[model samples]
Target: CSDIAFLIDGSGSIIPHDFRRMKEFVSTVMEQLKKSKTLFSLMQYSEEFRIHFTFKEFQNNPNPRSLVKPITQLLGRTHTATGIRKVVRELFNITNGARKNAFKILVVITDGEKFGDPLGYEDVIPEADREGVIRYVIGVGDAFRSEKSRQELNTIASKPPRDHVFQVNNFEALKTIQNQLREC
Candidate 1:
């Protein structure tokens, strides 16, 4: 089984429409995973990470309505490091202990480039990888398209193989990426 966590950015800069797109993306992904024995969890983060749900085995349901509801209720600012640390600690201390054979995956969906750390995710990402966690970062919107954003993501992404980091020019493309993940 695979343990998947959705780390969503709920910073102020994320507009309502984009938030809806994220919700839809997560809901659709969950619905698709219902076909398998995937174990899933969700974390909403800004300055902190909030676990909206613990890891639970997915159930296939043709109706997507109920799956999306839980995502809409989470609301939060952009404290990237804190959020990352919280989830990583949870995985190492709790989740990993319970499911040793499970593949640990973290999907971070963000629009704004991280501040404070000039080296981007150099500080936190290494720790996550050291804990045997595979991270996939999806950058959306204009913030991610900028030169600075490109450089930041590129630096962090370079640590992993080519498939781990993705840049989506449009939020609508998230569904396509979700489909790609299913094939993996």
Candidate 2:
């Protein structure tokens, strides 16, 4: 089975309403993947990172309602680097131990740029790519419309040959993009 980790940025800049939309989008994705042999995990980040859910196989009857509740409870300051590091640690734990062949995927959804060190993701991303993991970055909200943010995402996307980095003009795009991921 493959393991998929979703890194959600719960920084203050992300409005409550948009966060709710994001949770709904995530729940929909989970529900659509009920039959797949994929394990799901959720990491929420701001200044610190919180593992809302650990990697676990999707249940036959996954509880989307309950799952989204925990997501709504998260609150944080913007710290993209911390979230990346946490995800890298999780990937390293899984790939170094068992299930080496299992596909490792990370989906980072954020509206703004990294607030910490500029080179924060340099090591984490390369390490993940070296381990044959795929990383998909999604930039949401108006902040992502900046040329600089798009350039940064482009760099991150190039780390994995098969991975992609995208920028959404609005929260509504998440629903369509997530639906497409479910089809994969």
TM-score of each: 0.74, 0.76
Q: Give the local distance difference test score of model 2.
A: 0.63
- The alpha-carbon lDDT assigned to residue 53 of candidate 2 equals 64
Tens digits of lDDT, candidate 2, 1-184:
5666678878877777767756766676567666356667777877777776665423433566676675653565677766676676863365423255666767777775677534476766677677765666667665465888776576555353223665543344345434435554
For all candidates in order, the CA lDDT equals 0.60, 0.63
Q: Measured by C-alpha RMSD in angstroms, how accurate is candidate 2? A: 4.2
Error of 2 at 181 (Å): 8.4
Give lDDT tens digits, candidate 1, residues 1-184.
5676677777766767777766667676666666355666667776555676665422323344564465653444566666676677864345333256666777777775664322336677788778767666666665455887665555544244346566644444355445545564
Off by over 4 Å in 2: 57-61, 73-76, 95-98, 117-119, 158-163, 167-184
TM-score of 2: 0.76
